[PDB]
Amino acid sequence: TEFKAGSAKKGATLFKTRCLQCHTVEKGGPHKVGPNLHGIFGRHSGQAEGYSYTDANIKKNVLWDENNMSEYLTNHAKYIPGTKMAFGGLKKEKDRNDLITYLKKATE
């Protein structure tokens, strides 16, 4: 309940100007440091054919979902690979919620 599907358009602007330095989803761009983020949702975690995971994400065999994403922002570390992310929380929690909905669009 902490996360509510707001508007993907609003988050798209936020993602477009604050998330292309890595995932670069661009609907079809190079994985770069982070995964395209266009297939994290689907079967278990870690399903990028090109980008590779530390394998830790695969061992957990967890499916990434909007609920799981809430735990990732609120608590992330031992649960998933020691992967380090340049993002360290967002001052605007409302804007962060919009980003979550936008990622769902990346999967489909």
Ligand code: HEC
């Ligand atoms: C490059 C330094 C990164 C930037 C900046 C962003 N992310 Fe990232 N992200 C990065 C890596 C190294 C990984 C892979 C870790 C793994 O094993 O999957 C990720 C992963 C995510 C995930 C899943 C959480 C996880 O499994 O660790 C999400 C949903 C995610 N990243 C979201 C996200 C958003 C909101 C960012 C821009 C707004 C963003 N990432 C930037 C590396 C980097």
